[PDB]
Amino acid sequence: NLKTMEAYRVQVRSTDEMGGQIFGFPLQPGASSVLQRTLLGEILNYYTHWSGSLKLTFV
Amino acid sequence: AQVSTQKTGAHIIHYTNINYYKDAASNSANRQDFTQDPSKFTEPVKDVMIKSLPALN
Amino acid sequence: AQVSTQKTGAHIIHYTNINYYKDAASNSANRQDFTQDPSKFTEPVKDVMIKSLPALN
Amino acid sequence: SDRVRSITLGNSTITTQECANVVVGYGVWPDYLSDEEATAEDQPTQPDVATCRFYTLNSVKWEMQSAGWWWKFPDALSEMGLFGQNMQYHYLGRSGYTIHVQCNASKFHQGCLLVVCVPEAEMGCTNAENAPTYGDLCGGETAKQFEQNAVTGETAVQTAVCNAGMGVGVGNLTIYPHQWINLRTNNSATIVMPYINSVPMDNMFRHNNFTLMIIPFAPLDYVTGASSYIPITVTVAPMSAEYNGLRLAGHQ
Amino acid sequence: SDRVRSITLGNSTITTQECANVVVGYGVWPDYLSDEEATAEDQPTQPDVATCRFYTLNSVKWEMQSAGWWWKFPDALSEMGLFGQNMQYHYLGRSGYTIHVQCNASKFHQGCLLVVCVPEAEMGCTNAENAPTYGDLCGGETAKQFEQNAVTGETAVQTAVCNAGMGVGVGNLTIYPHQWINLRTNNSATIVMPYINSVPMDNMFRHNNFTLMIIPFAPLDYVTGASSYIPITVTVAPMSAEYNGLRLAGHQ
Amino acid sequence: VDDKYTASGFISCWYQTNVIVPAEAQKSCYIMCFVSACNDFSVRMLRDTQFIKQDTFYQ
Amino acid sequence: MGRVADTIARGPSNSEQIPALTAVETGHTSQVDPSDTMQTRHVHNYHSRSESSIENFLCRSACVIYIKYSSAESNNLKRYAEWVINTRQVAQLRRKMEMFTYIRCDMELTFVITSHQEMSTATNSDVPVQTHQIMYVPPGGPVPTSVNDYVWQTSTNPSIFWTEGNAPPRMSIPFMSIGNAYTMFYDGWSNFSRDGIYGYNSLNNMGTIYARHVNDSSPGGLTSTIRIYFKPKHVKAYVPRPPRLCQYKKAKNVNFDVEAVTTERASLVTT
Amino acid sequence: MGRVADTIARGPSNSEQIPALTAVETGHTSQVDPSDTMQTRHVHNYHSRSESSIENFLCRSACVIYIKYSSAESNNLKRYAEWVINTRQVAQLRRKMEMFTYIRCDMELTFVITSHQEMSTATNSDVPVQTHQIMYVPPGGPVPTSVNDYVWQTSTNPSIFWTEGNAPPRMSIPFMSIGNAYTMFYDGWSNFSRDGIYGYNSLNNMGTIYARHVNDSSPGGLTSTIRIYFKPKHVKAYVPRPPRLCQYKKAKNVNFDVEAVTTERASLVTT
């Protein structure tokens, strides 16, 4: 999915049980595979310290 | 001479700077300007959106 | 410039110090602070013990 | 008199009739974290009288060949009460203490102990290529005990008093808060430790704030026909405990 | 609009976008016991944000032949969180609630539920010489479910809706605090119960303050090809919990 | 950088209920995630990024 | 000064205000604090955003090329340098300036010049200390074609003479551009026919830096090397851009090879 | 300022005050003056406790390691340094900082870099003066793997360039730690399982200092050596500890070998 557009979206779907866990990843921006090539990961990889709350907005 | 505050760390602290050259491109770099304005990459919208209200009425 | 007293020996005596850098971690070391407080390794007890009285009444 | 004290914390109380003062470690009485020294941005639970109260650790027999004992904190209160149930549901915690060692003996017994609270006591290892396994530092409520002579194991803690299991002279443990239980004067020692660490709160399980040590400096001795078992009981009460950063059970 | 609410208790939050108000049971909002109505002479622990917060009970499938469900409280929170660890160390407790039943469905589904909080619901028994065994009243986080027709067991609870398992007309459960989840309007119901008992605090394990009941009054019905599983999830958050009279673990 | 001392926790996402959708619409949807820092966020101490490399000058 | 926002306490809420819900169907990103999704406490917060300015970000020196030249022509090194100024040779300094579309700044060029003796058959070799000349020819000037010619008279060209063993020589170059800012990405063409060179290389035209050994050649000969270092100052950078994801190919183009967005994971759910 | 207490005169006494008796069954040590056990005289005493501060005690430079590196690889010296920062290599500087549990301070790193020629078969050897680079990589940065690679571009890393014959280069390093003080003894483990590294080495993570010869290798080659020196400044040291009695074994552990408390005496009574 790395060279397609499928990278950026996770399929959620109707289930006939309850459905498990859609996704989960260790938080740690700029060193987590998920978060390190975004704009809070290529602007943290010019630094070696970070602090404060971040926020994830789902759609 | 211009006397300005140093970078101080949180919980004297002055330094003196004299410019010796006739060009203002020879002055030492600014590093004491910490001005910001996030709200034009962060909130570029025409009509103000209030946080506590729903975005789309 | 800050003008401060030198270490003088018992029975002029000033020196001038100007800080040239913008960080306060570039300043020369303190060595003129001789403050103490022995009574917290030496007398850490909750209730004061008076020297002239017996310790255990 | 000045030989009588009472300490009431929570619903527990402990009283003494031969006592030498209270040693407040470093002259700071424990109290809650301020808002100028905070660093964690969520409401701390403060159970108050549900965790601050005397807990009693297992008693150890003071033999005439005993070389001492130590209990690392707060790993000796990990199983005690509701204090131990709020280290398993929180990532952070801080709490002072008021260790009270007690050990009565007759007026025909003699012996001397050094009760000392050592912040950040980092223990050696018998093998110099290894760092000691967890079970050899901590016993929980049961003290791990010093040995008179140098021991050889592999992952065993180097226990010889004369080095105090830290490689420092054992007579020099005195800058650390301490009192002496000498059996011809007092019979109890009370050391009120504050929270001493370089960060405002720290994970209870992972890190051990201090280590109590009780080291006989004059052996127990008595003329036979007298009592031959005198125990040393250590009680300790958390003071101003607060925990923060709630998460699931465990410490995996 | 008036269809949107948010409730934040502790570190939990629950939000709705189809909602009909909040029903405050008997017009009393839960709050701590006063000093004029107290009766226990020791300091109550009040954990606050460590026990007041939404807990989620197991979801139940709403079939087209379902006859209802019930959960007795506070025996459904006996295993939940730190609420359930402060019923096992205290002889007393009191606490309001804010039951929030939720059950979304499409606009092509139809069905109606009655969500009702019944204080002191005392259940019948199939045999009239017996009083029902514990396992047949409570399932913990798992609901016990009503049956459409009269059942015959021995120690089994008499479950027939038309009597509501109490011998009272099922349509008359409406003086009790209630809302209806009707799938063409709202999709959530919020009932804030206060503490209702005849004594100021009472032992959590022994006595059940109230019993939630969810009873279909119009069956779930849909044209096939649509979703065939719609769950009903019940969350409930303690409000102003306080416990008193600390003692050892258990409930033996 | 990833350091075990100063781990930053985990993000996870679960089905609270289910995706329920009528007959004549798709049973698969998608969730996308965005990430941004809050207004209390800060960094310190520069280092060069390790996401770019070269063997020789480009010419 | 600049400091982070404080966290402000709030109690539980159960109101018809939804801070948490938002619509990202607009450019407006959510402005929620962590004081809007859980209770929090008052934290007076002293952190400073003082190293994340654009005059602390860009204001550290970085190498931009080395040129080698020789006093005997070691192996195709000529006897003088030559190098048409651009910032595109490296992938370090380049990447940080291709994170903004336009930048105006006043450089400081610092040169670090070192030498080493060649392999040679010369014996009894003793050389006096070298003096190196670094000449800057603004575009359209005359260009040297040999170690000694009239162009190195530096009749009006800026030039630095420096003798080895002294501190690295530096100077400041004011903001010099036709534009009101340097352009880091140009989408146009040189011609009006949409022909010829395309991209930012059309606008690039910053002159050429030459250098040579002032000293006449000794018998053994040497090979010197000069490393140019640019440090921005007084920087105002306009219009931000996503930083590069791909390795560069060329210094006149943005051509790239298609590359992965991110490193692998085993699955959606990983601890 | 700080000065010693004066001795105050007293005459003979024969009272019911006992200063001399005390009970050391408490942490309270006796506070007796020599004016309480014999008569004494008034002595105005001018001695100062001015060299026993913690900013005179710790505030002298001390060596903390030397690293050797070569321009031709003399004998397993590579062509660059590398050394993960800690204070535990030596027994001098280390001992004085293991006499306190926590210290916050601002170092001054001074490097003293010297070189000597190798034994080699090269003849007619003349080398220009060496230039040495000392780069500091804060933890988690990219690490060099050869004498020349992209990591030594020092795009944001602090770096010092220095040419032999000049005064030793120095700089100040501010107080940089996660904590509110450096930790000299940690009783915890890295993991929450009480597994992995134990002791102070868990918290230690201060980056790595590399160094190399800037100059391309000459035929004879050299071996340079760099000695790092730390001098604390602005020191506040909290919680004292008994100084070490035992020789150290390792730089990541406190392991020790059991040793004598004190040197011998013949008997209890010795003149």
Of the candidates A37, A39, A59, the beta carbon closest to that of G261 is on: A37
DSSP labels, E74-88: TSSSSSSTTTTTSSS
Binary contact (F17, E102; C-beta < 8 A)? yes
Distance (Å, whole) CA G38 – CA G11: 9
CB-based contact B16 C21, cutoff 8 Å: no
The Cα A55–Cα G36 span in angstroms is 11
- In single-letter form, the type of residue at position D242 comes to E
Q: Is residue B57 less than 8 Å (CB to CB) from chain G?
A: no
Give the separation between CA H120 and CA H128, rounded to whole angstroms: 17
State whether residue A58 sits within 8 Å of chain E by CB.
no
- The DSSP H or E segment spanning H228 is strand H222-230
Query: Do chains F and C meet with 3 or more Cβ pairs nearer than 8 Å?
Result: no
Nearest to D115 by CA among D157, D43, D61, D173: D173
What is the residue type of G130?
Answer: Q
Domain map of chain G by residue range? 1-271
CA distance E12 to D247: 13
How far is the C-alpha of H240 from the C-alpha of H99, rounded, in Å? 6
- For D47, the domain range is 1-252
Distance to chain G for E30, nearest Cα, Å? 14
Q: Do H141 and A48 touch (CB under 8 A)?
A: yes
Neighbouring chains to E with at least 3 Cβ pairs closer than 8 Å: A, D, F, G
Length of chain C: 57
The residue with tokens 């009588």 is: D4
Neighboring chain E residues of A14 at a CB cutoff of 8 Å: 227
Cβ atoms within 10 Å, residue D240: 19
D74 cis-preceded (ω within 30 degrees of 0): yes
Peptide bond preceding E30 in cis form (omega within 30 of 0): no
List residues bridging with H222 in a β-sheet.
Answer: H117
Distance CA E129, CA G161 (A): 114
Structure-token pair, residue B37: 């304005």
> What burial letters (b/e) apply to E35-63, b meaning 16+ CB within 10 Å?
eeeeeeeeebbbbbbbbbbbbbbebbebe
What separation, in Å, do the N-terminal and C-terminal C-alpha atoms of chain D show?
A: 51
Distance CA G182, CA G166 (A): 33
User: From CA D167, how far away is CA E140, in angstroms rounded?
Assistant: 56
Query: Would you give the distance in Å from CA A19 to the centre of its chain?
Result: 20
| Nearest-CA distance D86 → chain G (Å) | 20
Residue corresponding to tokens 């954990």:
E47
Rg (CA), chain D: 19
Chains D, E in contact, 3 or more Cβ pairs below 8 Å: yes
Cα D171 from Cα D161, distance rounded (Å): 10
Of E108, E223, E233, the CB nearest to F17: E233
Q: Which residues contact G50 (CB under 8 A, 6 or more apart)?
A: B7, B34, G1, G2, G56
Task: Flag if C45 and D26 touch (Cβ within 8 Å).
Answer: no
**How many C-beta atoms surround the C-beta of residue A16 within 10 A?**
9
Chain G contact set for D36 (CB, 8 A) = 44
- Chain G residue at shortest CA distance from D42: G40
The b-or-e profile of H255-266 (16+ CB within 10 A means b, else e) is bbbbeeeeeeee
Residue E18 · residue E105 · CB < 8 Å: no
Cα–Cα distances in angstroms (integers) from residue C43 to residues A19, D100, D179, D213, E69, in the given order: 65, 19, 12, 21, 69
- Of D95, D56, D90, D73, the closest CA to residue D200 belongs to D95
SS3 track for chain G: CCCCCCECCCCCCCCCCCCCCCCCCCCCCCCCCCCCCCCCCCECCCCCCCCCCHHHHCCCCEEEEEEEEECCCCCCCCCECCCECCCCCCCCHHHHHCCEEEEECCEEEEEEEEEEECCCCCCCCCCCCCEEEEEEECCCCCCCCCCCCHHHHCCCCCEEEEEECECCCEEEECCCCCCCCEECCCCCECCCCCCCCECHHHCCCCCEEEEEECCCCCCCCEEEEEEEEECCCCCEEEEECCCCCCCCCCCCCCCCCCCCCCCCCCCCECC
Rounded Cα distance, H100 and H182, in Å: 10
Which H helix or E strand runs over H94?
helix H93-97
Contact: D43, G39; criterion CB under 8 Å: yes
Pair D127, D96: CB distance under 8 Å: no
Which residue in chain B is spatially nearest to G238 when comparing CA positions? B41
Please state the domain count of chain D: 1
Neighbours of A24 (CB within 10 A): 17
* Closest residue by Cα to residue B36 from D233, G1, H148, E197: G1
Q: How was this structure determined?
A: cryo-EM
DSSP class per residue in D72-127: EETSSSSSSTTTTTSSSSEEEEEEE--EEEE----SS-EEEEEEEEEET-----SS
- Cα separation, B51 vs G29, in Å, equals 10
Residues in chain C with CB shorter than 8 Å from the CB of D186 are 56
